[PDB]
Amino acid sequence: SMNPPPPETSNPNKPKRQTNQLQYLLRVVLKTLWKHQFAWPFQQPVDAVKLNLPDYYKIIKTPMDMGTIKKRLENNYYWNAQECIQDFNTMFTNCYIYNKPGDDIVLMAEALEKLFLQKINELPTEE
Numbered sequence: 001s002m003n004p005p006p007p008e009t010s011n012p013n014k015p016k017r018q019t020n021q022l023q024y025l026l027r028v029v030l031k032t033l034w035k036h037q038f039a040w041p042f043q044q045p046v047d048a049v050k051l052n053l054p055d056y057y058k059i060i061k062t063p064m065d066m067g068t069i070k071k072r073l074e075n076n077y078y079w080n081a082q083e084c085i086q087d088f089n090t091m092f093t094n095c096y097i098y099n100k101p102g103d104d105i106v107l108m109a110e111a112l113e114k115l116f117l118q119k120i121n122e123l124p125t126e127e
């Protein structure tokens with residue numbers, strides 16, 4: 001029923017890059033999803049205490065959210081676009097795992113995911 005530490009957003013010994021694909025992930029993909037009317041439940045880690053979801057972190061062992069992703073991108077945490085793409089996919093999958101089909105939260109994730117897929121379809125070729 002307690003919240004775990006959030007995912008890491010800083011690690012000085014992890015090697016980093018700033019690639020055109022990663023810049024796209026921040027400037028197009030994250031920015032597009034973040035501004036959406038359905039973004040709000042996804043803009044920070046799940047607060048299992050506030051939401052009274054004491055089983056959330058029993059079920060979800062690889063938590064991810066766009067606040068974390070935003071921090072990672074702004075802090076140049078990633079080596080490659082795949083890492084960041086995996087984070088978005090983890091976030092969506094967690095939602096689908098934890099919740100029931102047709103719940104509001106699932107409809108919200110599905111809308112965000114549709115947009116995500118459309119933007120990733122146009123991920124620029126690496127420079």
Ligand SMILES: CCC(=O)N1CCc2[nH]nc(-c3ccccc3)c2C1
Pocket residue numbers: 040041042046051053056094095098099105
């Ligand atoms: C991040 C989406 C998720 O799976 N959550 C667990 C189930 C759930 N129900 N309601 C929410 C939620 C709504 C608004 C703000 C934060 C979380 C959530 C968060």
